[PDB]
Each structure stands twice: as structure tokens, then as C-alpha cells.
């Protein structure tokens, strides 16, 4: 029993964090094989962020200007490049601690663990979800750029996020491992705005499944609501609508508990309309939408990673 917000084992990823410096401005990078990925905004100084042009700044700079460090042992940059917002450095040695890896772009409502780094050294790890507005509610201070968001499937680490910038509302923004930002954001210190976020309904239902598995059942009403009928009520409360694919995603969770997916939506509907009534679900008095049905299974089935 017990249900926590869990981060993935950060072992394999810690082994890829390198420190990329450039005289005044330093940040973190990922060292997989003989490639070093680090946000392109490292080729800047305190004045270049105000209004940048990475297109030509990369051109006027070369291999020697980069200062890579694997803790203490500096690395030789033998090739520069710019795939969108990330900088592809080339090193004279493949990372001996490189895990089996994938590069994956995720959808909103999907989760990953973030290994927070400063000067190529990991300081902490936490579970995050791509909000439906493509921002993350992260915990990053200046110098946390480079820090990755990943997921572990079997023995293979799947990289999904690179930290680039913060927004004025305290929330965070970054690109995939190819440099394509998540959302309509650019890597500049310009007027940027997160926009209306919604609640990840598929993750809220999956969260209540973990509460049913862990004993909390008071909210389990014996009524039903059609899929569209639920989407009628849910949308009033700023909750992402439920697709039929979402129902298929909750299928295994439903089968493993006995409670139907359509029944669970009716238990959620009255939960939203009437409120908590003092009581808490899983120790919280708010609905947690940061648990995909997969994170619910991996926690409540002792799913380990090699």
C-alpha cells in the first residue's frame, strides 16, 4: 500500500550530465556517445538574451570556444552544430556510461522525471507533466538549463525534455531533444505568456484508480454517465474532454480493479459538482492530474528498471 508522486531512478541519466561553459555563461549538457546536447543559448552573454540571433552567432563562433567538463576532465569539441534550439557538440570520446536511449516527443498530459542539474552536477530529481498549455510546473533556478526530462522503459532511457527558459508566471518551458519547443515559445527574453491551462482528465481518473487500489473508496458512487454526458459536465470545470482512446488507455486499470471506466467518470462528475466535503483522496484535498494510467500501474505493480 501507499501512493506517492515518484521520480524514476536517476542513475543512468546522472552519468550523462556534463557542464558546458562559454567564459561568462555556463549551463548543462547531455553526453550520449560522442555527442553533447546543450541549449543553444549558451553562445550568449548578459546582454545577448534581450534580443538574440542564434542563426549567425553559431557561425561566428567555433569548436574551441566551448568548454565541456565531465566533472573535472575537460572534453575536446571536434564539431559544432545547431538543430533548432539545441547545440550538438562533438567529443573525442564516446561516453563510457551511455545508456540504451531513445529520443521521444511527448503529448500534453504525459509525464517524465526531471534531473535538476547545476554545473553538470545533479542536485535533485522530481516527477513532472507536460501541461495541456505546453508548460511544466518545474522547480528551476538560474543555471538549470540543460537539465533533462526522461522516462525509463525496461533498460532504455527515453529522453523527452531539455530545460531552456522560465516564463513570467513562475512556470517553465523547453524543447524536445531535436530542439523543437513545447508550445509556441521561442528561446528569447521577450514578452511570453503561458495561456489557459486545463485539467488532465485521463490522469485524474487514473489517480482515483490508484486511490481505489489503496483503499480510499468513499467517492465511489453507483451511478453512470454516458461519455459525451460526462464531457458536458467536465468541460464546465476547465477539464480536458475525454476521447474514446482515453477510455482504452484506462481499460487495463479498470480491469485490474473491477470498476468500469464509465462508472469512474460518474464518480468523478459528482466529485467535481459537489466537492470533497472535507475528506481527502490519497491524503490530498485537490485532484492530482500528474499521474498517467501507466504511472499508476508502474507504482502499484512494483515495476522495476534494470
Amino acid at each position: 500500500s501507499g501512493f506517492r508522486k515518484m521520480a524514476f531512478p536517476s542513475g543512468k541519466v546522472e552519468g550523462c550530465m556534463v557542464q558546458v561553459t562559454c567564459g561568462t555563461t555556463t549551463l548543462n549538457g547531455l553526453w550520449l556517445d560522442d555527442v553533447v546536447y546543450c541549449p543553444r543559448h549558451v553562445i550568449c552573454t548578459s546582454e545577448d538574451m534581450l534580443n538574440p540571433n542564434y542563426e549567425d552567432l553559431l557561425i561566428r563562433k567555433s569548436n574551441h570556444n566551448f568548454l565541456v567538463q565531465a566533472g573535472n576532465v575537460q572534453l575536446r569539441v571536434i564539431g559544432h552544430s545547431m538543430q533548432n534550439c539545441v547545440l550538438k557538440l562533438k567529443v573525442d570520446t564516446a561516453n563510457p556510461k551511455t545508456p540504451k536511449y531513445k529520443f521521444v516527443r511527448i503529448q500534453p498530459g504525459q509525464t517524465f522525471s526531471v534531473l535538476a542539474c547545476y554545473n553538470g552536477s545533479p542536485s535533485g530529481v522530481y516527477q513532472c507533466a507536460m501541461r495541456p498549455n505546453f508548460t511544466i510546473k518545474g522547480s528551476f533556478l538560474n543555471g538549470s538549463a540543460g537539465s533533462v526530462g526522461f522516462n525509463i522503459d525496461y533498460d532504455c532511457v527515453s529522453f523527452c525534455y531539455m530545460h531552456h527558459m522560465e516564463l513570467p508566471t513562475g512556470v517553465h518551458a523547453g524543447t524536445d531533444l531535436e530542439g523543437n519547443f513545447y508550445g509556441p515559445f521561442v528561446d528569447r527574453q521577450t514578452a511570453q505568456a503561458a495561456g489557459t491551462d486545463t485539467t488532465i482528465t485521463v490522469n485524474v481518473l487514473a489517480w482515483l484508480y490508484a486511490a481505489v487500489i489503496n483503499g480510499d473508496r468513499w467517492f465511489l458512487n453507483r451511478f453512470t454517465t454516458t461519455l459525451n454526458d460526462f464531457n458536458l459536465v467536465a468541460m464546465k470545470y476547465n477539464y480536458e474532454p475525454l476521447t474514446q482512446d482515453h477510455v482504452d488507455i484506462l481499460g487495463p486499470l479498470s480491469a485490474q480493479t473491477g470498476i468500469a471506466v464509465l462508472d469512474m467518470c460518474a464518480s468523478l462528475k459528482e466529485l467535481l459538482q459537489n466537492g470533497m466535503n472535507g475528506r481527502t483522496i490519497l491524503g490530498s484535498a485537490l485532484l492530482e492530474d500528474e499521474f498517467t494510467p501507466f504511472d499508476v500501474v508502474r507504482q502499484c505493480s512494483g515495476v522495476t528498471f534494470q
Binding site: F140, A145, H164, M165, E166, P168, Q189, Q192
Partner: peptide, 6 residues
């Protein structure tokens, strides 16, 4: 208040 490069 503008965005912040980390």
C-alpha cells in the same frame, strides 16, 4: 515582465 533565459 519578459521570459527568463536560464
Amino acid at each position: 515582465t519578459s521570459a527568463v533565459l536560464q
